Design a protein around this ligand. Structure first.
Ligand code: HEM
Length: 291
């Protein structure tokens, strides 16, 4: 399967910076969502789940085709709750009908991270919508109730190495789990709509307790009111993973630089970019724009 990136006709940097600003302005406006967390965390979860379907062996799935707009992927049980990020973006797509679905879903994730004061993520345009029959089947996204060997093995299919996996998981500092979407409940920290290295700090410094929640699932709970998934707590149970967790709890700039590289790679897996294709764009935030 080859997927060649094709720039939307005649569009350049300035066009996509208008779509960025449109998403970013609505993230500021629709601030009441999910008890004032806002839409940022569900938008970086949407960009990870449309990319997380990729398989390195046959190049199926991935962010290229925008296939989450089809019923099969939209109704995957693993995507429960992401309908709220889709409905957030649907006004912006009506306003910029020329951008492809894969490009809009991945740029929403980029925009949310930068606007929540994360690191800059280089983004490349050129994803092309593909037919309903190209939609990957349900079951390619990871279970939460498993251990470190499961996480290591699952992520080799997206070929992410240990460092990449631990840097990517730092995004679970954002937002929260919702019992009616996943059978898990609670946030992982105090700052859950500001991008920081707090996931690593809480994992190493809180007193975690294995409890059962109302959906009868086990999760790690702390006195402070935070929670960690079984696969999150895995990172301090494995010796290779644990020493990268310590590196990111002790250096927020290294965490930001490694997250940026692994999130761009996540979003770009499966896509062939021609050498006459433009460079990755670095978008300015509303703040750097005075907007
Ligand atoms: C083995 C890996 C992973 C598993 C099993 C997993 C699982 C989950 C689960 C069960 C939730 C709760 C969903 C809900 O109830 O609403 C969640 C939320 C979230 N996840 Fe993951 N995840 C994984 C990796 C990642 C990665 C790699 C990213 C991003 C780069 C990510 C970003 C998020 C975000 C931002 C939320 C919060 C969503 C919200 O607030 O609504 N996840 N994750």
């Amino acid at each position: 399967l080859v997927h060649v990136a094709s720039v939307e006709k005649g569009r350049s940097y300035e066009d996509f910076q208008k779509v960025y600003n449109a998403i970013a302005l609505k993230l500021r406006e629709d601030d009441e969502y999910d008890n004032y967390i806002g839409y940022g965390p569900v938008l970086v979860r949407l960009a990870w789940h449309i990319s997380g379907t990729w398989d390195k062996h046959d190049n199926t799935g991935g962010s290229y085709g925008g296939t989450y707009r089809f019923k099969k992927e939209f109704n995957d049980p693993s995507n429960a709750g992401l309908q709220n990020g889709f409905k957030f973006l649907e006004p912006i797509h009506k306003e910029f009908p020329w951008i492809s679905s894969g490009d809009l879903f991945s740029l929403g994730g980029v925009t949310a991270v930068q606007e929540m004061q994360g690191p800059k993520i280089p983004w490349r345009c050129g994803r092309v919508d593909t037919p309903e029959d190209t939609t990957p089947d349900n079951g390619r996204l990871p279970d939460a109730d498993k251990d470190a060997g499961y996480v290591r093995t699952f992520f080799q299919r997206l070929n992410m190495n240990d460092r990449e996996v631990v840097a990517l998981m730092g995004a679970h500092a954002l937002g929260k789990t919702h019992l009616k979407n996943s059978g898990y409940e609670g946030p992982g920290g105090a700052a859950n709509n500001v991008f920081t290295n707090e996931f690593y700090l809480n994992l190493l410094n809180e007193d975690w307790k294995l409890e059962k929640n109302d959906a009868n699932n086990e999760q790690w709970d702390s006195k402070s009111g935070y929670m960690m998934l079984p696969t999150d707590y895995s990172l301090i149970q494995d010796p290779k993973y644990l020493s990268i967790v310590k590196e990111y709890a002790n250096d927020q700039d290294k965490f930001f630089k490694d997250f940026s590289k692994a999130f761009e790679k996540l979003l770009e897996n499966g896509i062939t970019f021609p050498k006459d294709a433009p460079s990755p764009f670095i978008f300015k935030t509303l703040e750097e724009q005075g907007l």
